[PDB]
Amino acid sequence: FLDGIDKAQEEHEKYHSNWRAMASDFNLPPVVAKEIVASCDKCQL
Amino acid sequence: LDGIDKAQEEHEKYHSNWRAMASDFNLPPVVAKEIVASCDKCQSPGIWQLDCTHLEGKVILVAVHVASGYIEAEVIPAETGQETAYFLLKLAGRWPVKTVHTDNGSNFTSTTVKAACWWAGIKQEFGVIESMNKELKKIIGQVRDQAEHLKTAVQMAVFIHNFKRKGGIGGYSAGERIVDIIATDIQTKELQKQITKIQNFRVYYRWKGPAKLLWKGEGAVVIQDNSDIKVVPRRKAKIIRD
Amino acid sequence: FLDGIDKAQEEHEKYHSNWRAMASDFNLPPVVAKEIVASCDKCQLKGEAMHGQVDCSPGIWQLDCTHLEGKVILVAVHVASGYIEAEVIPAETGQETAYFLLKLAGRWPVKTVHTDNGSNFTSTTVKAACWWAGIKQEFGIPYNPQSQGVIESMNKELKKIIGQVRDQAEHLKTAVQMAVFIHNFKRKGGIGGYSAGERIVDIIATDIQTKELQKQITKIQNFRVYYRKGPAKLLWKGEGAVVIQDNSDIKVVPRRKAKII
Amino acid sequence: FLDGIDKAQEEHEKYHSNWRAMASDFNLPPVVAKEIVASCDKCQLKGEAMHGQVDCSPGIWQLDCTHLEGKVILVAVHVASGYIEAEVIPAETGQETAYFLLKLAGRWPVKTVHTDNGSNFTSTTVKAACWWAGIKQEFGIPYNPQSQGVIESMNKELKKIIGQVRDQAEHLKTAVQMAVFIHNFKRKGGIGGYSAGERIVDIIATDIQTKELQKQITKIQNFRVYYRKGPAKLLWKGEGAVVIQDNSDIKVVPRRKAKII
Amino acid sequence: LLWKGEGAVVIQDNSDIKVVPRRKAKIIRDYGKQMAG
Amino acid sequence: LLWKGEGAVVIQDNSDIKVVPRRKAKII
Amino acid sequence: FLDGIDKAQEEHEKYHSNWRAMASDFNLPPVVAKEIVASCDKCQL
Amino acid sequence: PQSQGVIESMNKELKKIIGQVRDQAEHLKTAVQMAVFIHNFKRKGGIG
DNA sequence: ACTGCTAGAGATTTTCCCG
DNA sequence: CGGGAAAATCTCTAGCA
DNA sequence: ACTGCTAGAGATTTTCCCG
DNA sequence: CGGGAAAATCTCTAGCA
Ligand SMILES: [Mg+2]
Ligand SMILES: [Mg+2]
Ligand SMILES: [Mg+2]
Ligand SMILES: [Mg+2]
Asked: Which annotated residues bind Mg(2+) 3 (chain H)?
């Protein structure tokens, strides 16, 4: 997601949260959360 | 009141601590503490590690709460006993600090730091700190772009560590863990206050010999005598201060 | 009263006599004289006698600077507990304030900050800091310090303790930290006979634990109450009563005229 | 507690922890911790929470100057009634004050005047005026305006009414006299639903009449009450009680154990 | 404490159930009374 | 008057929205 | 304790009396005197 | 960096539990299961 | 749409402890 | 059930802005 | 040995008037 | 004796210094 991707994205942009945390915090399927991490230049899965 | 025997048998079987015996059998925490403190076969929230890392020609003074992994940190202008004693006074005014471990540096051995620890009631003492320095530095690396200055990056990294990194058994952050630990410690100390208070008494039930006082409820007076816990009415017993 | 109404108005445009004066002089029911006063724009000069109540939610902090011996002290207080954070800052700038607020948010859970409308709290740097840490900002009504009564009371308490320990320390920043320590851990009172440090720990742990307890309770327990109405969700029951959430409205109903499904 | 007393004192010389903090930490009876606080000179920082009461004898006036639009207004109030006298004076001088006070004393009975310690009220010319008219001067404690609460409250009331009628008059002195009129006769309230003019007339007439009545009563009536004691002079009797003046002491005694001669 | 919601808390104060807004309520365990009984 | 809370109101004074504590307002 | 109370305790050690002196002459609160006589092994009351 | 030290910490926990269990068993093969049941259910803590 | 509070000093009432 | 003292609760203020 | 008060706005309780 | 409205009493504040 209910624009959860959008919210998780900004959370990560600031705190670079792990995928489990984003999956749980924004109710996103793991695959979507892991993609947010993969898209970031500052992280690794 | 009628679970004291049940709690006794439960502890003889399972050696369970007083918190379970009290949450389950509905007994005052002092009675359960006695049940657990009357058997031989059944026999940290204030300790901080201090250290000073270095990043980009600047000193980051770091303080880890050992039991929880909760971090307090700050770019300090000069690795000196002055700024260290200031950081320590701040820390001790925000959390209940009883013991700090440092590595025999010079900022940690000065007279100013020892004076501050003396004023605040902190005892000084001379591996988790290195790992936590590593994690802090890594978060700093992830968020160093998000700030102009490095003190802001340090505080953002501290925020992320304490509140955004859920982990461990229950999946808590270090903020929740330090809160839970300190609250348990407040319980420990208030229970000790109760016990310390009522250990200066002597009772006399039914008159029988002097007996240790354990509780003094509204409808009964729980005591101990000959390593045995007996519940007698308030009228039938006499409590005198000794 | 038709005669007296015209005269009392003429006398009121000269004298602005209160309603008792018009009622005594021109023989008027108290309601008519009161209406004469009420419709006078020049006689509306007094507010209503009450005080509001500040928000004491577990996540709200109140912030303000206070001045002592020519230095600026940035003081924050957790409203629910009375716990405090304070530092000497070099100047009342938005940058110093953003830094203080970031440190506070990284050490404690901070959902909302409530300040006055000073230039440092309204600045874009403080806004950017509050956006990053997820902190709502509440601005007090201008020229209304009672809006921040808690932090104003705490600034008095902190100034008194600094005065008490001033000659135990050379610099002011150290006296400020000694006073912070003292207030948080060496002064007991308030709701649970606590010190403020003990009290903030209890408030925050209670928040965590009750959240978890009731979440589990609502996960396992599932019912539907019909009272008087629609399918109201059940919250609590006992002692001849039920608590329900019907269309985001919580009401206490007796057990009679209430059936649980 | 012998151990804990020595420790709580050492902690108090650092922290100045209040008594609850010492009692919780060092296991102390509340009376012992309170004694530790009480004997600390650095911890005595708060007065007692009460207010006094001003003298409202029928002959007492409270005086003070107030400032408005750059002019000095000399305001007096009769404490018992709320009646007021006020004039614009050219300067806050002892001479203007002596003149005002002489006019007041020649128009109304003035036994005592109560003012603050400003230079004009303390001056020798005001003293000479007060000596001539037979007026006792009461000086308020310095820097304590609550000592003259009535005239300070009345200065607020008078400033509000002047504000209400300001645009009905050119000069300030005339607005001051219009406001005086309005307050004295066009505002009703207080103890007897009175205006202040009505009320001062009633207070002063009541004083005169009761003085005369009771003087005659004591002239004609003459007795001696013995209670419990000496020859107490009788003041009143009724409803199973007697009032006596035994050695300048008034006491209410029941009819039993009391015999009148 | 009977029920704790987001914007309101449901309490019972001497056999008298009340709904209190969240901003008007402070919720503690109180550890002294607890350790005592 | 636009909105009335506990402790404060919002008011329209010639197209100029103000927030006033209820201690400093009078509603007729 | 206060210098007066310490002097009273020393006078007890000199004279083996606790309540009869400090509770009356030294104006000590009764709770402190009771605690002292409880701690005092020479005061069987 | 949570499991890395907690594994040894809860190894110490189980050693401590056996330190009390052993008084009710002559052979470790049963005492170990006794400690395991204690640490699986009769020790309740953590979050709530 | 947002809002007086806190801590201490003394007064008053309640509770607890020996009868 | 009765006092009496000790503890708990209540009333009220300054001082912060 | 001297001392907060007053007037208004709204809330609450009391009294009076027809039953 | 019962409501209901009108009157009287109560609670509480700003603003004066
Ligand atoms: Mg401010
Ligand atoms: Mg301020
Ligand atoms: Mg003056
Ligand atoms: Mg004046």
From this structure: 8
Beta-carbon pairs below 8 A across chains B and C: 68
G42 has a chain B CB within 8 A of its CB: no
Give the H/E segment covering residue E12. Answer: strand E8-12
| Number of Cβ within a 10 Å radius of residue D152 | 18
Structure tokens at B206: 């039914």
Task: Chain C: list its partners (3+ Cβ pairs within 8 Å).
Answer: B, D, E, F, H
Q: Cβ–Cβ of B158/C107 closer than 8 Å? A: yes
Q: What is the CA radius of gyration of chain D?
A: 27
B16: left (phi over 0), alpha (psi -120 to 50) or beta: beta
Judged by a CB distance cut-off of 8 A, whether residue B67 touches chain C is no
Alpha helix stretches (DSSP H) within chain H? 3-21, 28-37
Residue C232 CA from chain centroid, whole number: 32
Q: Residues near F7 by Cβ (< 8 Å), separated by ≥ 6?
A: C50, C51, C52, C53, F21, F22
Q: What is the resolution of this structure in A?
A: 8.0
Q: Which ligand is nearest to the CA of D143?
A: 3
Kindly determine whether residue A42 and residue B142, on different chains, have CB atoms separated by under 8 Å. yes
What span, in angstroms and rounded, lies between the C-alpha atoms of D254 and D243? 9
D133 phi, psi to nearest 5 deg: -90, -5
Q: Name the amino acid, one letter, at H38.
A: I
Per the CB < 8 A criterion, the answer to whether C83 and C184 are in contact is yes
- 């409203």: which residue's tokens? C79
Q: Residue B174 in contact with residue B70, Cβ under 8 Å? A: yes
Is the C-beta of residue C187 closer than 7 Å to nucleic acid chain I?
yes
Of chain G residues 9-28, which have a CB less than 8 A from chain B?
Answer: none
Q: Residue D61, Cβ neighbours under 10 Å: how many? A: 27
* C-alpha–C-alpha distance, residues B100 and B63, integer Å: 9
Give the ligand whose atoms come closest to the C-alpha of residue C159: 2
User: How close A20 comes to chain B (CA, Å)?
Assistant: 9
Which residues make beta-bridge pairs with C212? none
Q: Tell me which protein residue sits closest to nucleotide I9, measuring alpha carbon to C1'.
A: D48
Interface test with A, best of B146, B155, B156 (most A CBs within 10 A): B146
Question: Looking at chain D, which subunits does it touch, using at least 3 CB pairs closer than 8 Å as the criterion?
Answer: B, C, G
The method recorded for this entry reads: cryo-EM
Q: State the nearest residue by CA to the C1' of J12.
A: D49
Q: SS3 letters for A5-20?
A: HHHHHHHHHHHCCCHH
Q: How many CB atoms lie within 10 A of CB C4?
A: 16
Residue A40 assigned as binding residue: yes
8 Å CB contact between B232 and B223? yes
DSSP letters for F1-28: --EE-SSEEEEESSS-EEEEEGGG----
Instruction: Give every CB contact of residue E13 below 8 A, 6+ residues apart in sequence.
Output: none
Exposed/middle/buried for residue A41 (C-beta within 10 Å: 0-12, 13-18, 19+): exposed
State how far the Cα of C254 lies from the Cα of C225, in Å rounded to an integer.
12
Residue B123: how many other CB atoms lie within 10 Å: 12
